[model samples]
Target: SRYVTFEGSRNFRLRVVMATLSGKAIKIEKIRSDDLNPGLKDYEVSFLRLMEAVTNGSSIEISYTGTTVIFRPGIITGGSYTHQCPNSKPVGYFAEPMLYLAPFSKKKFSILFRGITSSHNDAGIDAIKWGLMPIMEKFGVRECALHTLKRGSPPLGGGEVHLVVDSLIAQPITMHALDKTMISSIRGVSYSTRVSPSLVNRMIDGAKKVLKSASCEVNITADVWRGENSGKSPGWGLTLVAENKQGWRIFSEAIGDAGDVPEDIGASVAYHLLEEISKSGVVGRNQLPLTILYMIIGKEDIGRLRITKDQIDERFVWLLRDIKKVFGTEILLKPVDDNTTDLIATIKGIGF
Candidate 1:
């Protein structure tokens, strides 16, 4: 019944997700107190509303200045609902956190999210579809899907996406993937809204040109949205996915801005995907946090993952410390081999 206290506004989404999952109330203070525009932003407030809509019996209180918040834990009574996301942040910002909470909900989770689908600041919808969903499948959380009704670009957004999670995982399967396998094929999606459809093909060609060095089976599909489904703005983006022999995937993406060219977006994403593959991790760098979270909440058994040393950023270290505070789970790290500075993270789950 005691509250888990935290300072600052960093990692707000992850903190909220973990708080809900652990059934722990949380107190957060000093949210950008010294900034010119102090207190919670519009997007953060919107996210809180989302949490309220999806759960039952939760209470949230904010100080007069909006710089402090105390959240009471609640039961996740998942059901069908709809939410309007603020344009400042993409729908992915909201979708990613939902993935962590949906599997353990009381009922099936289905929500229609309306807002920007692709943006520079957050993961595109395609990345979640092709990149993160497969990781969930590995943990035995199947029967989840993201259906895009419209492609919405940033600023004055109008996008609609339906997310459905029907399967409730009683317990996550322990993961022990340590060896990195060879990439067998590369696939991707190039999408454009309210723009020339030929641009999509240009993106594919540019990406294939750069991927020729890999000498693998590469197939990039074009998705051109027109008329009613093209949302409010004109934009283009590319999401590249590489799958290894073990079916582990690495995802990278680039969203084209006003002056950005489609070809450059395609090539840049390809190079970024290559960089992630070269890092020598079973999961991509961006996927480390989710993988670690699953490991902590899996059945009470040892789970291991291989990741490069460079993948451990400051935020990741903070996540580890926070996990210790909330779940009392310690993740041990050891070098993978003498030749490489890669690390193997081993954790014993608490069986949540």
Candidate 2:
């Protein structure tokens, strides 16, 4: 059955009551009003609008306050989430958004008003009306009222109203689903995988030959493609080459990466892959389906290189050759543009 979730607006004291939903058109009754200053109304509008817009269209992320209440037209589930928004900073959950914003959503919010204190200080009532209320409206969401809880860390605003208003109408939930660009990386779509154990062994032996012949380091990153959903590239590979007196070692681990994922996220994943294989005692083949997300980083070896704009001429004739090779790959190519980074490296094979 379709259900409605409630999000609180900036500092406004709202009461979410679970009432009968008989096409009662989302009732918006303010439980309490705070000091209003006509002077800073515009700024207030901007803030309200921001929150309103967000609440109107997103769901995987439930903006947490005191408690999460779900409304299904006529019925409301869960208790009121009394928020103490008076003068305290706007802090709560956007769950997924917070997770992304806080680098995996470690813990972007602390329950500010989990309980209410005696000798009521209005539970930061002033703040609730000012900072948080408008932002909620800005996001095109219905506002929430503040409630208090006894012994609340900072609580003072609680009364069931979310379902009462929610029964009338509920907003849509928004989520940042995987886009086509990221979807293409999901393994089977356009990826091409070639796996043959016998062939792989032969290739490793051949690589050993090349390493010995060139006297150059041979680091052949191999890919093992098992993820059918992950583009067509089963990216994991075995590394082969004569690194030492052993002369030729078979190293396989290429949970692949071809620029679909952010290079940094990819790099983090690569390290995980190497560690998983290296520490095989605890690692399992069960973990072989690791997704390698690469987020390219500039200069792991520190020490900034200072290059003046006028100093660099078209000295990289080879770079120009390679750049042309990638023609129509829909890559940006320009010289002396404001955005292009100075210097080029054939070895790195990237655009900065």
Candidate 3:
């Protein structure tokens, strides 16, 4: 089989995961090669270690300078495994990819990850919990469970998450969610650690102000943790998710830095989520990657999905194009209007 060569780290996880599913080995070069300290970071190596743990006889090689690397994947022999994620990245860094691999493994998988839970860089555990977990039920993988045992922030992390998934449900996903409906309600969490509880109240008020202007009712709860579960860092963040009656969901978030205020963080997340809702589509930018991967490996059928140009932008489209080219699958696109701002993606899977 021909191997794919990619540069930088844009689609690194997707490349490797797709390779494993398609049984096509990949060769990635120039991994941060131009940077001052080029090579894989500690977290990437940690990710590779996790990848190796779930698969049997997988071959992973890296060059002396760490610029060039190659990975040959084997059968996914997933089982109970635990990983100590590098503090540089959040638990979502590992959680995102594992969710894709878990449903197609040779055996049922139960994974435990210890690291940061919520951060600006990746999707927080709460986002996955409120947003995507219910979507997994659509594929008949009902036994899966995702839990966040503790809360952690960046730089100094001590969070924990547990995920359990079954193997090879192989159910067809038929989606035609072009009709975007008004959000029934908004639900979110304003979380703070090692900080005043009043900060959570300010954030909630700010977010409610913005969301109410959009003519939608919002219910947000505050979470303040102290002592042991507070983790090593002092920070706060908010995660807001919106859904319609049809189960179409979208979400937004913001994390606090040294100079950030609670009100601005709250208003920012509210506006972001509002923008996604106005964009008018079933899947938002945050959920697009997972949907694309599911379409690639889903049961052989017309896996129809409604997507917008904003949601499926250049990077993700190129990713889908490359993967379909490699796996000998094609996505048929149809415009829904003269403006053609919205379109539908029809993917026929290989039943993998």
Candidate 4:
């Protein structure tokens, strides 16, 4: 079979995801050849293991030096499985990509993922629940849910989460969300594991203090885990989501590190949520890539979206190019107006 060729370590996860979805084999080279400690990291290898676990007949070949990888994707054989993720990266790192692959699998994708649920590098479990899931629902995928059975922090992680994706979409429904909606309310979860429960309240109070000026209804609940369910580490974090009546949502989260104050974590996350809400888009910047991916895989019609200039960062540009390369989908962009820095994206799906 002819293989799609790529280079470097950048966008490794996205590359694998597109290859799987498009049923194309890929050869990635020079992962980190020039670095002192060159080659694929532990987390990336673990991620490949997860990809293999959720699929049938998929083949992955890595060079002895670990700088090159050849992957041939196979049928997505979704079913009940358990995976132990490495502590180097959070479970969210694995969960995010799995969310994209699950809906297209041969059967319902049900998995128990054990690892760090919240970390600085990836979206926390709460953000995945309240933020990404709703956006996915708009594209007609249904019955997808994430259940957190244990709270895991970082370093020595032992958290557990049950993820179920029970429905499939032949093609995503067309979306025309061009208007940015006003934020009407804010809600969040302040979670603590093996830490002082009072810290959760401090975080909530800190978030509330900053959010009081927004003049919207704000409610943040505390989630304190005890005993074995708290995992092997002591940590706390805050995940906030701001939403409007139009169903547009923005999410922001911050995890507390050693010696980090809970109040600071909550306050920073609240401010970050406000910043995301202030952006000129129907969906948050962090959600743009996935939303665009869904749009490209939707029914054969032009889907439209409104996004801000700041959201079109370098990484997003690479994603656009990659989408074109792998799926042959080109997204056209036009300025919304002279007064605003927003742009309307016109995307035509392949009806996949």
Worst 10 residues of 2 by lDDT: 288-297
RMSD of 3: 2.1
Alpha-carbon lDDT of model 2: 0.23
Where does model 3 exceed 4 Å of error?
166-168, 337-340
Judged by whole-model lDDT over C-alpha atoms, candidate 3 comes out at 0.78
Candidate 3: tens digits of C-alpha lDDT, residues 251-333:
88888886787888899999998887777466777777777667767777777777776766687677776676557787777
Give a tens-digit lDDT track for model 2, residues 1-352: 3332222332221111111212112222121223342122332233233223322222222112212223222222222223332322222211111111111111222222321121122212212322233222322234333332121121221211111112111321121111111000001111123333433333344434423444334343333323322222222222221112211111122222334332233333334333433332111221111100000111111111112233223532322332232211111222332453432111221221
Error of 2 at 69 (Å): 30
lDDT of 4 by residue, 1-352 (tens): 6888888998899899989988889999999899998899999999899999999999999999999999999888888899888888888898888888888888899999998888887978999998998888888877889999998888777899989988877767898977876788998899888877898999998899888887779998789988998999888989998887766679998998888877788899998887888874888888987899888888788999998888888978998988887888888898986578799999998877
C-alpha lDDT of residue 121 in model 2: 21
Q: Sorted on lDDT, highest at the top, how do the candidates line up?
A: 4, 1, 3, 2
Ranking by TM-score: 1, 4, 3, 2
Residue 123, model 3, lDDT: 78
Candidate 1 lDDT, 1-352, residue by residue in tens? 5788887888888888888888888888999999998899999999999999999999999999999988887998889999999888999989988999888899999999999998887988999999998889888898889999988887767999998998898767999987764688998899989888978888888888789887779998889988878899888899998986565789999888878777787889999988888875788788988889998899889999988887887878998988887788888998876578888899898878
Clashes of 4: 0
Model 4 global lDDT (CA atoms, 0 to 1): 0.87
